[PDB]
Write a protein that binds this ligand. Structure first.
Ligand SMILES: [Mg+2]
Ligand SMILES: [Mg+2]
Ligand SMILES: [Mg+2]
Ligand SMILES: [Mg+2]
Ligand SMILES: [Mg+2]
Ligand SMILES: [Mg+2]
Ligand SMILES: [Mg+2]
Ligand SMILES: [Mg+2]
Ligand SMILES: [Mg+2]
Ligand SMILES: [Mg+2]
Ligand SMILES: [Mg+2]
Ligand SMILES: [Mg+2]
Ligand SMILES: [Mg+2]
Ligand SMILES: [Mg+2]
Ligand SMILES: [Mg+2]
Ligand SMILES: [Mg+2]
Ligand SMILES: [Mg+2]
Ligand SMILES: [Mg+2]
Ligand SMILES: [Mg+2]
Ligand SMILES: [Mg+2]
Ligand SMILES: [Mg+2]
Ligand SMILES: [Mg+2]
Ligand SMILES: [Mg+2]
Ligand SMILES: [Mg+2]
Ligand SMILES: [Mg+2]
Ligand SMILES: [Mg+2]
Ligand SMILES: [Mg+2]
Ligand SMILES: [Mg+2]
Ligand SMILES: [Mg+2]
Ligand SMILES: [Mg+2]
Ligand SMILES: [Mg+2]
Ligand SMILES: [Mg+2]
Ligand SMILES: [Mg+2]
Ligand SMILES: [Mg+2]
Ligand SMILES: [Mg+2]
Ligand SMILES: [Mg+2]
Ligand SMILES: [Mg+2]
Ligand SMILES: [Mg+2]
Ligand SMILES: [Mg+2]
Ligand SMILES: [Mg+2]
Ligand SMILES: [Mg+2]
Ligand SMILES: [Mg+2]
Ligand SMILES: [Mg+2]
Ligand SMILES: [Mg+2]
Ligand SMILES: [Mg+2]
Ligand SMILES: [Mg+2]
Ligand SMILES: [Mg+2]
Ligand SMILES: [Mg+2]
Ligand SMILES: [Mg+2]
Ligand SMILES: [Mg+2]
Ligand SMILES: [Mg+2]
Ligand SMILES: [Mg+2]
Ligand SMILES: [Mg+2]
Ligand SMILES: [Mg+2]
Ligand SMILES: [Mg+2]
Ligand SMILES: [Mg+2]
Lengths: 46, 100, 58, 103, 94, 77
RNA sequence: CGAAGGUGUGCUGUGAGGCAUGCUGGAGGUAUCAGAAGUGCGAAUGCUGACAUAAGUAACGAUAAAGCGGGUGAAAAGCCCGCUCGCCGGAAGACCAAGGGUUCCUGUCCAACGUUAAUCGGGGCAGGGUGAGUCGACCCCUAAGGCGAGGCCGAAAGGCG
RNA sequence: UAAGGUGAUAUGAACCGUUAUAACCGGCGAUUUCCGAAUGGGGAAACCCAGUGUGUUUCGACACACUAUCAUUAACUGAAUCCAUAGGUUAAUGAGGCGAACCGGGGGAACUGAAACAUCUAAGUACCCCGAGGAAAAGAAAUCAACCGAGAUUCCCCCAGUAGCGGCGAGCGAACGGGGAGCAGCCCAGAGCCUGAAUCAGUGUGUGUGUUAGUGGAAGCGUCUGGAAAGGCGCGCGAUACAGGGUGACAGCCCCGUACACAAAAAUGCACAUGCUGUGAGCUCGAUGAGUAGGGCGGGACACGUGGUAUCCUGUCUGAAUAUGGGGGGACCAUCCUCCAAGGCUAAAUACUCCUGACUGACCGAUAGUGAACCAGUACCGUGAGGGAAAGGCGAAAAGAAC
């Protein structure tokens, strides 16, 4: 079939990337809710 | 109990019991059903009741002679072996020395 | 350290000039099969460290 | 401030080798000192052909605690428990029993 | 011009391989494991001035290191640059 | 926004009561206009988002006094 | 000279129960009396961890097909070589952009992995292997569309431009 | 400060060092590539591309400094037009982001309970957003009181679940006044006076006392079992040290510390004295903060909710006396009492603990304690926000089994 995950790096870095988390002020709180619980995979940039 | 209020699974359907949380107080790593808070324990007893208790305790020590009376008892140097050997040759074992 | 502790910077110019090359010869013999001693590297690195310390002061 | 050091003649207080005498060889600050010829424990070396380690049994000394031994002063021939004092501007250790300054 | 601190700090080792010896013996080429921040206009300017060898071209690349499974730990080695550097005709380094 | 540039008025909320006194939220917007007001100490005009009350206020006091409180308040003219 | 815990053996009350010693066990524990209880379990298709039956039973994942002689090996149906047979040949042949990230080659090992055996491996370990003026990315310029100094408009967030 | 060290996983290697430059040790200055407010533009964050200037220059490339944006000040070239203004172009100072809790400003919700639900409750509760701080908000009479009075807010206990509010249903809930911690009052709305006069220190000093390393610091031996004394038996000893932990099992006197008493070259805090970058007290005169109190209209806060409702904040419309005066005293007048907004400031009593040091537990021992006693926000599962585990034990010392 045509399954759910169809992978693309140039879409993933623009959707769930760090510079995607950049401009949205409601996303700065998301980064500040991952740093302040201390995860290793902060965002899915590589 | 740190997690979230999400169910494990939906209620009806698969053949198990109606689970409710990952903080379930009958589960492993669950909660405690009647956990108690940081509290106090001091009761209150009266002025009259406390002084009556003191007058009650000041009687069997007389009737059993575990209270003894001495006028002067001290030492003239800050040294503990002097009181140790004073109690030694006074021949007492467990003393409560109340000064004036 | 007490030799270099007084020294002038014009000495340190030629001293660094030979010193980095002595570190390089030392490390290329650490690469090849002649150096069987394992302390001169740690010597020469702190040797460059102790003069790069004083190069700010003078 | 080391009450027992690396190059002294020391007596074992208690344990298996109580009362016996011997010299310390070298020292570890985890609370263990090598004292020579005291506790001969077994070891079974594995024979490797590298560096010519042929194996065989080796009876080696065992390390032992600093707080299980005390110094062996020939001025008493007994248990001397070292103290400290200052002479001539340096820490000099003396003997708290029989009052001999170690020099 | 290029300064002697970089000129001395840029090389790291000569490499050894069954692949390396063939380019040694056929084409008068050296096989250098170099640091990662090396450029072709600088490796040549180091080995020309220092070792007194006539050189013209450098063919860089990057070897990437593998993942080695240390029991219940996992680890991956480091980026290190290689360089196949062909010397001009008439020099043999010892 | 609604920068009432004389008196500083602001949309406050409140209620919308029914006649069974059922209530919902609302707003209370202030009256504004956009006046090209005429001043004498510079002999030209100046744009202003005055309120309804501020138009009474300005001709009561003066215009140079409004410039004086304004440029020291910080917000422009 | 042997405590808790475990284990058995007599013996004792109306019962919750109590008593000591045989064995393992190798540092701990309790009297009478009063004081605080996260205080007693079979059941909640309850929770987490281990073990049964069904049962050494159905299956071993394309009905394209294998047979024999030699090597290596502690034993070869599957490994290497040899030569008979078969199957695709607009694919199951020969390459790249996607995506994965040593799966690539060279020695060595068979414990888990492989739906069987297993010397073989895409498995474990170690060592080598990715060379550009011309070929792909940056690079000069844009399309949809994103941001957008000032600017306008929203309670702040901001919304457009 | 001292004979030991080159961190651990986890052992070999060339080693330093023994009477003081071996290393852990506290303070002081210097080193800190790139990403991130990222700030020279750009970007799919750890990548790419440039400029001006000072540099040398084996004509060959490198070194370093600089440069966003607005907030506010000066300049200089300053449009439609001559003066005027927008507007750029610099230079200087300031601001960006960061994280537990408490505070306080703009908004603002539901299941629920009423055994139904709509007024109401849940509640100004959860949550968004903004700000200044280690405190913040207030605060020094248009208060309260009954014709006796008390004299600002803040903050704890009462009067009390009472007089009120309420489909007078569910429930909401004060004050006057008393008892406590703490109590400090002040200057602006100036024409002329003393001339640098208290005041606050942001500062000049050092002291007291910390603080960031330290130092000394008491006092037992023989024997009975045991593999092992710390045990069992004797006779001792120190106690302004019987807090604890460790060493082959239960120790005051084997090790560290414990009582006590000292230590700082540098740097710093809190209380002090002293001219300081700027202080104007005190003293006579006065004036007494205008689109402002009020009123009408719809809401919200006051315990006040299809009211007899005081009072205060404002969206909108009209708005006077001004000390002879103006307000309030639970509608309203009359009579007395009390006090002067429209301009601000101010210590402590008050809350919380990501973070630092100690001490304590009728707290729990690996399904109990945070989720994590072990490399836990990890392997893993979800494209993403986000959710999230199982899992400790040889030994006295590994001496870990030569052959
Ligand atoms: Mg949900
Ligand atoms: Mg768990
Ligand atoms: Mg729990
Ligand atoms: Mg000891
Ligand atoms: Mg290349
Ligand atoms: Mg409503
Ligand atoms: Mg005015
Ligand atoms: Mg037995
Ligand atoms: Mg038992
Ligand atoms: Mg039992
Ligand atoms: Mg045991
Ligand atoms: Mg034990
Ligand atoms: Mg114990
Ligand atoms: Mg059970
Ligand atoms: Mg039952
Ligand atoms: Mg059940
Ligand atoms: Mg089964
Ligand atoms: Mg079975
Ligand atoms: Mg069968
Ligand atoms: Mg069958
Ligand atoms: Mg065959
Ligand atoms: Mg077959
Ligand atoms: Mg065919
Ligand atoms: Mg066909
Ligand atoms: Mg492989
Ligand atoms: Mg292989
Ligand atoms: Mg297998
Ligand atoms: Mg097999
Ligand atoms: Mg392969
Ligand atoms: Mg393999
Ligand atoms: Mg070429
Ligand atoms: Mg091309
Ligand atoms: Mg476009
Ligand atoms: Mg825009
Ligand atoms: Mg903008
Ligand atoms: Mg080490
Ligand atoms: Mg940048
Ligand atoms: Mg940028
Ligand atoms: Mg570009
Ligand atoms: Mg609702
Ligand atoms: Mg409802
Ligand atoms: Mg109801
Ligand atoms: Mg305040
Ligand atoms: Mg009065
Ligand atoms: Mg001590
Ligand atoms: Mg000490
Ligand atoms: Mg007035
Ligand atoms: Mg009004
Ligand atoms: Mg009215
Ligand atoms: Mg109205
Ligand atoms: Mg009023
Ligand atoms: Mg009245
Ligand atoms: Mg006032
Ligand atoms: Mg657990
Ligand atoms: Mg257990
Ligand atoms: Mg995954």
């Amino acid at each position: 079939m045509k399954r759910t995950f169809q992978p693309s790096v140039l879409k993933r870095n623009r959707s769930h990337g760090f510079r995607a988390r950049m401009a949205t002020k409601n996303g700065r709180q998301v980064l500040a809710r991952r740093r302040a619980k201390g995860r290793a995979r902060l965002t899915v940039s590589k | 109990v740190t997690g979230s209020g999400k169910k494990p699974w939906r209620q009806k359907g698969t053949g198990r019991a109606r689970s409710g949380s990952i903080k379930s107080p009958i589960w492993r790593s669950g909660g405690v059903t009647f956990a108690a808070r940081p509290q106090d324990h001091s009761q209150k007893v009266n002025k009259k009741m406390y002084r009556g208790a003191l007058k009650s305790i000041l009687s069997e020590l007389v009737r059993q002679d575990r209270l003894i009376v001495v006028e002067k008892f001290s030492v003239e140097a800050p040294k503990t072996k002097l009181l140790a050997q004073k109690l030694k040759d006074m021949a007492l074992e467990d003393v409560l020395i109340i000064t004036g | 350290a007490k030799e270099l502790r007084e020294k002038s910077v014009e000495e340190l110019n030629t001293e660094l000039l030979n010193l980095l090359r002595e570190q390089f010869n030392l490390r290329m013999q650490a690469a090849s099969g002649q150096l069987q001693q394992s302390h001169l590297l740690k010597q020469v690195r702190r040797d460059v460290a102790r003069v790069k310390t004083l190069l700010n002061e003078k | 401030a080391a009450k027992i050091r690396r190059d002294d003649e020391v007596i074992v207080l208690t344990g298996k080798d109580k009362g016996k005498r011997g010299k310390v060889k070298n020292v570890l600050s985890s609370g263990k000192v090598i004292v020579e010829g005291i506790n001969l424990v077994k070891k079974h070396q594995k024979p490797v052909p590298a560096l010519n380690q042929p194996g065989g049994i080796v009876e080696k000394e065992a390390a032992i605690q600093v707080s299980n031994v005390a110094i062996f002063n020939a001025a008493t021939g007994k248990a001397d428990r070292v103290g400290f004092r200052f002479e001539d501007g340096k820490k000099v250790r003396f003997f708290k029993s029989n009052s001999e300054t170690i020099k | 011009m290029i300064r002697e601190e970089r000129l001395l700090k840029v090389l790291r080792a000569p490499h050894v391989s069954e692949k390396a010896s063939t380019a040694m013996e056929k084409s008068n080429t050296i096989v250098l494991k170099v640091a990662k921040d090396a450029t072709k206009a600088e490796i040549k300017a180091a080995v020309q001035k220092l070792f007194e060898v006539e050189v013209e071209v450098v063919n860089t690349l990057v070897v990437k290191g593998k993942v080695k499974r240390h029991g219940q730990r996992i680890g991956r080695r480091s980026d290190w640059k290689k360089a196949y550097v062909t010397l001009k005709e008439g020099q043999n380094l010892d | 926004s609604r920068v009432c540039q004389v008196t500083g008025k602001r949309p406050v909320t409140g209620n919308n009561r029914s006649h069974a006194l059922n209530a919902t939220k609302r707003r209370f917007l202030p009256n504004l206009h956009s006046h090209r007001f005429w001043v004498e100490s510079e002999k030209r005009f100046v744009t202003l988002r005055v309120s309804a009350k501020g138009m009474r206020v300005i001709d009561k006091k003066g215009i140079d006094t409004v410039l004086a409180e304004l440029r020291a308040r910080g917000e422009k003219y």
